[PDB]
From a paper:
Jasmonates are phytohormones that are pivotal in mediating plant responses to various biotic and abiotic stresses and regulating plant growth.
The crystal structure of R283E is almost identical to that of the wild type (RMSCα = 0.22 Å), except for the R283E substitution and L6, which lacks 16 amino acids (V285–E301) due to disorder. As R283E initially failed to form a homodimer in crystallo, we assumed that the amino acid exchange disrupted dimer-forming and -stabilizing interactions. However, our DLS results showed that at higher concentrations, the monomer–dimer equilibrium is clearly shifted toward the dimer. R283E showed the strongest tendency toward the monomeric state among the variants, as even at a concentration of 5 mg/ml, it exhibited mainly the monomeric state. Structurally, it is unclear why R283E prefers to crystallize in its monomeric form while R283D prefers the dimeric form.
Residue numbers in the entry: 9 to 284, 302 to 385
């Protein structure tokens, strides 16, 4: 009947349905340590056979540009994440940790010793955009420091080590955040990447960083535990490309080759809808594997996406904020409850986080 409740084999993982929790930063992980509130939040949304992706999670002390986002680069963070993974696995769900480096989308207040954020480029995000500060005001993005290739290789090692830490905490896998104008996208997009070395210029060079990140995590934990998220067609944080479809296809070609070289498929490719329908289907058709679509989906649009072959899985963000039982509501076609944008990024462990009710 409802194709969202057709089972799906996501490689090693047997899913009972196709409704996915999209990664969402919520800023409840005080001092970058996962908290009991995150356990309650993910437990509420977990279902038997359902797939969850965490909020973006720091891979290193320089990787953050939001307040109170979790990390997975210290043993303390690993120990606390395990408690969260455990309550999600108790409900029979599958959960991946999203690994997130913001690059130049940061601020002195978020950096050790107030050092400059790192990027592909020395140019700041323009003041068309503002950063959320810890006090809830909006600040100015600073000038970043363009990193050399040794430092690039050390960032890759931060992804690799974080992927191993995620597996130690019990996560089923990880997702590489290569979207939305953050560090990887600062190398992908020719509206940002002004390098004249082997990581800039040509499509091949701009794709080197994501390829190396993905290959490192695949070697460390196995391709079937790795997902990759990208967003070729956007303007967020000035992340425009002159040819988004060609950039997306170049990325897809690199993922297909990583799979051929490794003898195994990635867990999935995850693409968010252009934000400033053909592009989505074109990347899906080009990719040898599982495709998760995201961005503006509703019950009806997700049913259509799976029914028409546009995606294998559909991820939902904002509707999962305010509907902890979103999966059940979609199954029953029960009315969905609104979300309160004001409390997307506040620190309260309950209000606007775990106090959205279930169906009566
Ligand atoms: C509050 C909030 C936080 C988000 N944080 C992340 C994040 O940490 N990583 C990421 O890749 N996307 C993040 N997103 C984007 C969502 O994963 C998702 O693509 C978007 O919400 C999908 O559209 P929808 O809300 O209409 O379902 C966030 C979105 C929202 C609204």
């Amino acid at each position: 009947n409802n194709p969202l409740f057709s089972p799906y084999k996501m490689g090693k993982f047997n899913l009972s349905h196709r409704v996915v929790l999209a990664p969402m930063t919520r800023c409840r992980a005080l001092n970058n340590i996962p908290q009991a509130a995150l356990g309650e939040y993910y437990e509420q949304r977990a279902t038997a056979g359902g797939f969850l992706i965490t909020e973006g999670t720091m891979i290193s002390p320089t990787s953050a540009g939001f307040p109170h986002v979790p990390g997975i680069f210290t043993k303390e963070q690993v120990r606390e994440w395990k408690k969260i993974v455990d309550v999600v696995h108790a409900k029979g769900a599958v959960i991946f940790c999203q690994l997130w480096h913001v690059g130049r989308a940061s601020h002195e207040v978020y950096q050790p010793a107030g050092a400059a954020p790192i990027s592909s480029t020395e140019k700041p995000i323009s003041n068309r955009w503002r950063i959320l500060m810890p006090d809830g005001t909006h600040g100015i993005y600073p000038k970043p420091r363009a990193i050399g290739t040794y430092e690039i290789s050390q960032v890759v090692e931060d992804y690799r080590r974080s992927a191993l830490n995620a597996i130690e905490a019990g996560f089923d896998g990880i997702e590489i955040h290569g979207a939305h104008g953050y560090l990887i996208d600062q190398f992908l997009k020719d509206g940002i990447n002004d390098r004249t070395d082997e990581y800039g210029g040509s499509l091949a060079n701009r794709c080197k960083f994501i390829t190396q990140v993905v290959q490192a995590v695949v070697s460390a934990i196995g391709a079937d535990r790795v997902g990759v998220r990208v967003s070729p067609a956007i303007d967020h944080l000035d992340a425009m490309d002159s040819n988004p479809l060609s950039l997306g296809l170049a990325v897809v070609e690199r993922l297909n080759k990583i799979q051929l070289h490794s003898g195994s498929k990635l867990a999935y490719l995850h693409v968010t809808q252009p934000e400033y329908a053909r592009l989505m289907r074109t990347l899906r058709n080009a990719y040898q594997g599982t495709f998760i679509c995201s961005g503006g989906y509703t019950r009806e649009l997700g049913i259509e996406a799976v029914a028409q072959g546009d995606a294998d899985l559909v991820s939902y963000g904002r509707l999962f904020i305010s509907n902890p039982d979103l999966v059940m509501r979609i199954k029953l076609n029960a009315p969905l409850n609104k979300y309160n944008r004001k409390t997307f990024y506040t620190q309260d462990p309950v209000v606007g986080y775990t106090d959205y009710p279930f169906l009566q």
